[PDB]
Amino acid sequence: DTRPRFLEYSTSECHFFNGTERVRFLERYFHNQEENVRFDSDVGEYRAVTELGRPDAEYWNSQKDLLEQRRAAVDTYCRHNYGVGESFTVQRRVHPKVTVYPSKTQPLQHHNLLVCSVSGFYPGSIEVRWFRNGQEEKTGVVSTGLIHNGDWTFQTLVMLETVPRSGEVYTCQVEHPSVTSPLTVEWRAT
Amino acid sequence: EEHVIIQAEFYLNPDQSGEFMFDFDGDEIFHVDMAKKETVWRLEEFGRFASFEAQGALANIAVDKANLEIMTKRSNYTPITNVPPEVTVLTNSPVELREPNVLICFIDKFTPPVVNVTWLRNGKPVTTGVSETVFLPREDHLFRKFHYLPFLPSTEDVYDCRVEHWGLDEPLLKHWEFDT
């Protein structure tokens, strides 16, 4: 199918700061990936983003009932919907699963890569550090970055490039909002 | 911000496809099944704590459809530019032989929101236990999508996520096999 496509897209966005103490509402209208008109509660009226949206900004700003709907949206829509799902979104906390396993930077190599897997957690904010014999390892650390699984869970792999010596103990340390104390997992060279 | 809630909706011609969904900090809270005219919660448990009138979404889609017709005329029938997706295949947890796991196919940064996705096991299409998300919003207004395939890890099975998009010259295949 090589027929031309035409896409009409719109978002109604609620931005929350310090709980619901500060709230900003944005309604945005798009056509073929181009935003052409928006309402920003900071302004209180529609504004054209591009010339193609100018007729609608003017038309919509002439409708007092529409504007007052949008001006009240931070309360009737944003703060309301925030309250509706607060218990299972804002207060959602899922403990990370933490495991450590050895790997290789390339085949035909000795085990020279330590992988700290941190998975299944929520929210996405996480902090993972490596230690060797009680000292933080800041060099040779590479990671997948934060990975979203698309199902209200996240994961990450934090890897340490190192050459383990006999008797060395490596520790992966994890901080996450679901806990008030760091999680630690040890790995021992055989 | 500390949190962001987004109601995202689109209507697409000539496919006549519409979608309506709520997003919380990047995750889907729910979408509306246009066919069944029903609310679909991303996690089953959500439905026990909250509700939503799907008829409100259908009304917005009707507006989006009307607005599309108006914009298409105004822009002189300028077609959307295809932006082909990036695809990543991964597991949701470290793989252990004979330990049940889930393959994830992440389709990202594309538009229009139309895609054909096929899971392949050893080159053969597999549909058992598969699932998928609707099209999810991005800050750059491109889309993302997740496909899932539960599986029993083995050394004798390889996997591919095959993705078709009008922005691609050929199907894009992302591979997975057991790591040594």
Binding site: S10, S12, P55, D56 | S51, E53, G56, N67, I70
Partner: peptide, 13 residues
Amino acid sequence: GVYATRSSAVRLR
């Protein structure tokens, strides 16, 4: 609780 929809506005014809 019940999630609210922000109705969409119809563009100028």
